[PDB]
Design a protein around this nucleic acid. Structure first.
Lengths: 105, 125, 36, 17, 247, 50, 50
RNA sequence: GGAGCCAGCGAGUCUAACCUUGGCCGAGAGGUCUUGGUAAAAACUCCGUCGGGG
């Protein structure tokens, strides 16, 4: 009676921390800067399971997508993948001239 | 001549014209069969007169319904009133008075808005 | 006369839109087959 | 040092007219 | 070389001048002698560059506008691998007129980069688009025959498409540039970016453009010059004229 | 002469279509077929007129 | 016109109601022809013209 | 995000912004082209997706 197994929590990628249990789309959104279509396209560019968890995505595919995010324009990628005194003068002028207006009227 | 009859139905601001003539047993509402009225919860309310009476009396006739104006529920009540008064009129004109009367009794015992509408004029004291 | 004698003795446009045939792009087979 | 001389030309043309 | 010195003058004054940095294109304006024939509609006709590219479809954000139902359009263009990463957004005209109004139209102009629509709806397009897009001539949408199939008289038109053909068409219109036909003598055309390429690219650009516009053949697009071209002035939107090739 | 020949062909075409339509109005029992190329035509019943 | 529309008097009987007919929209339809006999040719007359 | 579908008053040869970039034309008056930036049916139903604030 034995079976063996083939999980990592919140990651520190590019100066900010991102959660560890939710799918790779929500992961690549919580990474600071970029968007959903960007996420889905770069993940199908690196050929990773869309459905897998952030607890999944072990170190080799992790560093691969790190390479992609650090240098995207090398992967057939588009540009939508990246990301007083006059008040004083007008106040004083109008108030002064309207003062004189009151006085002459 | 073709033995035919015509009636009107009316909710608050909509109009439901119903032609009824002898035919092959079909329904048509705005050039589309009546399995395809829109609101999909009041489709049964449209179905109500047929399911009140039976089905053979609508197996031996031809309806043609056209509605204009109003909104959803208003149109729907309009169509049901039009179908009711049209069926009763066709029965009155071409078949027996006794069938017309039993039709009228079953309808009005169920719900009188089928045979007479209420255009809601206010009551000022 | 040979044309007339034989018959006597025997491109992207629209029908309704004429602005298309100047407005289009005469695409290049290189700009098709190539992958930049 | 071309830009200034041509805008000079523009100004002097208009005032010449 | 006088041309190249003048271009140097333009780019260095562009560096110094505060307003000139904030607009980032170059226009060649031509004055010829004679008035041109065709009335000015708003179908920008394209001009080819032979040696030097300008822009990349994989570099600009794209809007596509369809016929009405747009279902097979959107799904196929989204799902079939040649245009999966190309267009920023596809939308139909009726959906557009429902969706965007006034300030929303202006936000569209602020956001999206280049617009292309079907040929069969270009004629109606600027009316829902208004004239904020139609200030001058920069963001003029183009027109693209979608299905590579032609409608004969008295026959039902076939619906189809191919990402192959539409990708080639966008790569053509984004590689090379477009002009607008007028009636008056003077005309203008955008040529090149000040940083994306350099002065020899710009001179070769000008040579190919004036050659294609002088050539007698290819008449629906390239036979635009009637009479003699008098002079060419290089200028930005906010710079001034620099005169070359006066005779 | 070429123009005249082409004009003649057009005229005889229109005359034949009009002639079949004119014969379509007299008598008999008619039967409508669609030739699967897409042609519309007729065929009469085997019925000798009196 | 509006004051006539106020006093419509909805009971009248003009004998032209046997000959005129009306759209469902309410507007009164009229003929391109004008007459009372050329509403539709009959099959004899169409034989002759054809 | 799609897709389905519904009203009613209204019609005076009458209904409409701004500054800016320059070419050419004319004695002008100004005319025409060119060019950049700022003010101005819906709820309904059904399907598909997601689950503190600058």
């Amino acid at each position: 009676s034995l079976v063996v197994q083939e999980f990592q929590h919140i990651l520190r990628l590019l100066n900010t921390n991102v959660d560890g249990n939710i799918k790779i789309v929500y992961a690549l959104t919580t990474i600071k800067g970029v968007g959903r279509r960007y996420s889905n396209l770069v993940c199908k560019k690196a050929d990773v399971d869309l459905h897998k968890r952030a607890g999944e995505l072990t170190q080799e595919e992790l560093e691969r997508i790190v390479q992609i995010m650090q240098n995207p324009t090398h992967y057939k990628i588009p540009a939508w993948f990246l990301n007083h005194t006059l008040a004083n003068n007008v106040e004083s002028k109008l108030r002064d001239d309207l003062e004189r207006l009151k006085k002459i009227r | 001549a073709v033995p035919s009859v015509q009636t009107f139905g009316k909710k608050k601001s909509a109009t439901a014209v119903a032609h009824v003539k002898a035919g092959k047993g079909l329904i048509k509402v705005n050039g589309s069969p009546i399995t395809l009225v829109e609101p999909e919860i009041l489709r049964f309310k449209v179905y109500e007169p047929l399911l009140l009476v039976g089905l053979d009396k609508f197996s031996n006739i031809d309806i043609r319904v056209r509605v204009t104006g109003g909104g959803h529920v208003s149109q729907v009540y309009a169509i049901r009133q039009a179908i009711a008064k049209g069926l009763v009129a066709y029965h009155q004109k071409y078949v027996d008075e006794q069938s017309k009367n039993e039709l009228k009794k079953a309808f009005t015992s169920y719900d009188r808005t089928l045979l007479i509408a209420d255009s809601r004029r206010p009551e000022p004291k | 006369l040979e044309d007339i004698q034989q018959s006597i003795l025997k491109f992207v446009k629209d029908h309704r839109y004429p602005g298309l045939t100047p407005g289009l792009a005469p695409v290049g087979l290189s700009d098709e087959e190539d992958s930049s | 040092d071309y830009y200034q001389q041509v805008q000079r030309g523009k100004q002097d043309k208009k005032i010449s007219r | 070389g006088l041309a190249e010195k003048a271009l140097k003058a333009l780019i260095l004054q562009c560096e110094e001048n505060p307003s000139l940095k904030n607009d980032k294109d170059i226009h060649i304006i031509i004055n010829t002698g004679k008035k041109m024939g065709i009335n000015r509609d708003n179908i920008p006709r394209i001009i080819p560059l032979t040696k030097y590219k300008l822009f990349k479809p994989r570099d600009l954000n794209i809007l596509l506008i369809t016929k009405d139902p747009s279902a097979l359009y959107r799904e196929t263009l989204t799902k079939d691998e040649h245009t999966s990463e190309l267009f920023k957004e596809i939308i139909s005209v009726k959906n557009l007129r429902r969706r965007f109004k006034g300030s929303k139209l202006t936000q569209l102009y602020k956001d999206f980069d280049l617009v292309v629509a079907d040929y069969r709806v270009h004629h109606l397009l600027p009316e829902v688009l208004g004239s904020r897009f139609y200030h001058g001539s920069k963001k003029l949408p183009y027109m693209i025959r979608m299905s590579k199939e032609v409608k004969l008289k008295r026959q039902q038109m076939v619906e189809k498409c191919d990402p192959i053909y539409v990708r080639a068409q966008l790569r053509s219109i984004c590689k090379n540039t477009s002009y607008i036909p007028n009636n008056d003598n003077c005309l203008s055309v955008r040529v090149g970016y000040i940083q994306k390429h350099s002065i020899p690219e710009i001179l070769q650009n000008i040579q190919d453009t004036i050659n294609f516009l002088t050539d007698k053949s290819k008449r629906p697009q390239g036979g635009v010059i009637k009479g003699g071209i008098i002079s060419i002035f290089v200028k930005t939107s906010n710079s001034t004229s620099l005169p070359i090739y006066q005779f | 002469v070429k123009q005249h020949l082409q004009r003649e062909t057009q005229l005889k075409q229109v005359q034949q279509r009009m002639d079949a339509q004119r014969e379509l109005l007299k008598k008999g029992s008619k039967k409508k077929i669609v030739d699967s190329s897409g042609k519309i035509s007729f065929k009469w019943k085997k019925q000798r007129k009196r | 016109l509006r004051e006539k529309a106020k006093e419509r008097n909805p009971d009248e009987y003009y004998h032209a109601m046997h000959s005129r007919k009306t759209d469902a929209k309410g507007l009164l339809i009229s003929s391109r022809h004008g007459d009372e006999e050329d509403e539709s040719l009959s099959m004899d007359q169409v034989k002759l013209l054809k």
